[PDB]
């Protein structure tokens, strides 16, 4: 028997845990004994493009770092992704939950912890391609984990980057604009998207100051398709997300510094870091 080899008639499903964009992840107690005493697992499966979820499979089942979710196995019939669960649930609904419990530095010590298992992965060649909050699951209230890796696809062969064939559900407003105008994603445009889950993380995931409302009070919420190519602009203007309340200088720095125009200008994970441990220690 296979400890990662998880049967469909064993797992029994609790809750919807989160949405993604081609997967749906629920909590399931697998109990083979059948009884209320398996343990619970994170359970992805398609809505009904199997190949993308076999691909992510690959992906994670060879992923090992702290803040990276551990992968827990798989169910074949047709393919099931089985995850671990992570009680706390992600940033999205934990930082509004426990604003007080999280201050300034355990907001940094998130960042570098990001940065680290987004290095982990871009030094696999590897690029993430949906990098924002909601995408973020808590550990502990010391230890937080990137949860999904639906959109991530390998680097190609001498190449710097990703050509994107399909983006209908793009996250535009955490994209940098070499993914808006090239369509062609470099581990730099990772950068730009970790600047945006970072504001999001110093206010705390709020609805009424999330990335898209905010950039929207620059363009207008009545554009529809013109939406995109009004961003670009703003972006080439110089323009970018306002310091959210209560971020220092120091730091509000290095989240401009996420935003550098050009991918083979713009900073990498280890300088982040870096960054970030010389405000920490
Ligand atoms: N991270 C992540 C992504 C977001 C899209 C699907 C996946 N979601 C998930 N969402 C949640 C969750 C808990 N509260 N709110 C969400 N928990 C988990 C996962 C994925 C894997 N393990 C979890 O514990």
Redesign the pocket.
């Known amino acids: 028997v296979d400890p990662t080899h998880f049967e469909k008639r064993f797992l029994k499903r609790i809750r919807d ?4 964009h081609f997967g749906k ?1 629920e909590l399931c107690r697998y109990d083979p004994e059948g009884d209320n005493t398996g343990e619970q697992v ?1 359970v992805k499966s398609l809505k009904p493009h199997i190949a993308d979820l076999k691909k992510e499979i690959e992906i994670l089942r060879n992923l090992y770092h702290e803040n990276i ?1 551990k992968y827990k196995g798989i169910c074949t019939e047709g393919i099931k992704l089985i ?4 009680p706390s ?2 940033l ?2 934990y930082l509004p939950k426990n604003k007080n419990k999280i201050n300034l530095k355990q907001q940094l010590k998130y960042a570098v912890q990001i940065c680290k298992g987004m290095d982990y992965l871009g030094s696999r060649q590897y690029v993430h391609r949906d990098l924002a909050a ?4 808590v550990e502990s209230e010391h230890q937080v984990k990137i ?2 890796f639906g959109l991530t696809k390998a680097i190609e062969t001498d190449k710097e980057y990703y050509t994107v064939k399909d983006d209908r559900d793009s996250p535009v407003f955490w994209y940098a604009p070499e993914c808006l105008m090239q369509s062609k994603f470099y581990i730099a445009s990772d950068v730009w998207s970790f600047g945006v889950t970072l504001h999001e993380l110093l206010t705390y995931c709020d609805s009424d100051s999330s990335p898209m409302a905010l950039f929207l009070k620059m363009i207008g919420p009545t554009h529809g398709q013109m939406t995109v190519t009004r961003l670009v602009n703003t972006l080439k203007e110089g323009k970018r997300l306002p310091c959210p309340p209560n971020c220092p200088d120091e730091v509000y720095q290095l989240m401009r510094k996420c935003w550098e125009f050009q991918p083979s200008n713009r900073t990498s994970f280890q300088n982040l870091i870096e960054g970030f441990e010389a405000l920490l220690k």
């Open positions: 845990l989160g949405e993604g992840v994170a979710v995850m671990e669960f992570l649930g992600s999205k609904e909601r995408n973020v699951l949860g999904d």
